[PDB]
Design a binder for this molecule. Sequence first.
Ligand SMILES: [Zn+2]
Lengths: 520, 183
Amino acid sequence: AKNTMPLVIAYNNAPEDDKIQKLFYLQKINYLLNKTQLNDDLFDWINDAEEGGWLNELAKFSINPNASFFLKGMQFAKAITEEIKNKPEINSSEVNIYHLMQERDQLLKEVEFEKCATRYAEINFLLNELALNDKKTKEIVERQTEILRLVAPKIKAIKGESIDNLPVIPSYKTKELGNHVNNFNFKFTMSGWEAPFVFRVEDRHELGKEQELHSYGVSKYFIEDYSVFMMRFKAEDGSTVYKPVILSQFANQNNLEEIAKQLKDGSPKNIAPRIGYYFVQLTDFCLKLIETHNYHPDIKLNNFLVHNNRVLVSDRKTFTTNDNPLASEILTSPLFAPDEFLKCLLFNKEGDPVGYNRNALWKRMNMPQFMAYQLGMALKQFLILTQLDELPDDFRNPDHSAVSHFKTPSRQIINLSLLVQELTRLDPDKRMTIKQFQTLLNFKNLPPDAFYQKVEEVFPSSQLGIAEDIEALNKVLNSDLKGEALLKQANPVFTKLSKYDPKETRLTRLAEKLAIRCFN
Amino acid sequence: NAEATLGSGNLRQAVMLPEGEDLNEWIAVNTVDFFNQINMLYGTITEFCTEASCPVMSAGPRYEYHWADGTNIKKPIKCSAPKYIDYLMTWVQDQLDDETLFPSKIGVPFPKNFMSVAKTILKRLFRVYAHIYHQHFDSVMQLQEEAHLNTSFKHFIFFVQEFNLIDRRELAPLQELIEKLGS
Ligand SMILES: [Zn+2]
């Protein structure tokens, strides 16, 4: 609510030989406008181009107000480095750009200039050194700078567009109808670039979460954004609302759901290796997101774009920093949500969520185990969609595995189907973790029996409470008896296994190998 | 920054021959896996590998690659990297889809010449990795996928080394990288 006024005062009061202090307060204000809901007056302030205005003063330092989080940071770093007189110890091979960005953002978040001026200058110096001497960083800055230069007229035309003529976007949590059409989400190409670009309008009034994530390694899985700015829209009431407009490349391969459906009409031996390629990215993204103390409660195949065979995410409105939130504090899709979430909802006839029940007032989700379940259902939907045109009605039934929809499954499909069951157990504390899943993906070519042994080494069955019955099935399987004579020493353990409220997959698998030996 | 890897299980263990497993079958299933990986990874930079960027298939100025045709009797062909690789992927997929060569059924055995077929395939898969690293690592860095490329190449080369499927002289264009990833 326009909390920037003490920093405008400090900027004005700063001596003008000390332009590093000036730049520190410009970046501090900028870090705070990204966390601030815009009202009518603050919009015109951040859009003031004449002298005394926010935009006019950023132009003085060659800083683009519409630049992406990363490139606006590097433009600050370039301006600050023009003013530093004491040069730090140059060490490029020892520098991590994400660590520099994170520690810079913590300074802008809560630290006064007197307590951090020198470290604030050295961090920006190191950032600029990467832009000058690191080929990777230099070409990123060169590409975003050029794109931002070629799309400047479109940006001013968007800002220059009438508000009575600006669109109202209706709300819906779906994908069957697809993306709603407004004037801004139309593909286009710029002269000299074969790839098409697109503007997107997000359903949010501030980019506070977006700003934290772009300094973390997990942002590698974000579609590259080239421009960001708030825009006026019309609300349901007709009043003015403020939403971010973000420019990025158009993802040329739709999403992961459509990628799986294309595998139906390809060579079958390609399915399991390609699942490895895609899910190695999904798994690394999840672990990297969890490392930042952020969590994704709406994991599903169609929520992950694919562009140049790279799995990417653009819907980050649902990310939360809360590892143990209540059911009403997260957005998710009920078809892929774990049962601990579904037990907090009420349903009408045919099973549609219509609200929350008593449980939603106290029941919390463990987001890492929540994500493991959804990642498991993403693998299950992927596997099934390579065999069927639509998802089957028994898709949420854990007793109906993904491999049960394969007519001629290979070993890798059998092993991947087992991973689904390990990730989607009912008890969240007994689900395979995403880290364990990441370890086992590299062993998917193992013979099914050897792969089951690998799962036992990674995720021991003792930690599921089934160790008592594992020795009961192993005792009979280690016996020399065969045929019906073995079956009556296997009858007691069999009936003990049919008395399970949810069937434990690991016991269902060992009982069958024991059932085979009984039939002769 | 440049030699980054992904989290994974221990890849030295993932390429080991499982107990009681036929060596031919272990080569078959991992060859199909590696082909799909390098096929997907080459698809990420394919728009940057053009006729103008790579007029001859190579792995740096010291390693030019010609294509040895399997159906026409003629000197190995000097061609561009897009033409070489776009034909290599179609050529390998045909070997993997052929059930006389890569049998997927229970009672269908591997041919006598399977080991020579698989080693030709794996040799040319290496040539795609080598071309990507030498001529397109800049594009790899712009897509932020050096960890996935290095991890796929790490897995692929650990399997080649485990069973000695590519001659060391052929591995020369990436010997420094193989050593760095295998220390
Ligand atoms: Zn090339």
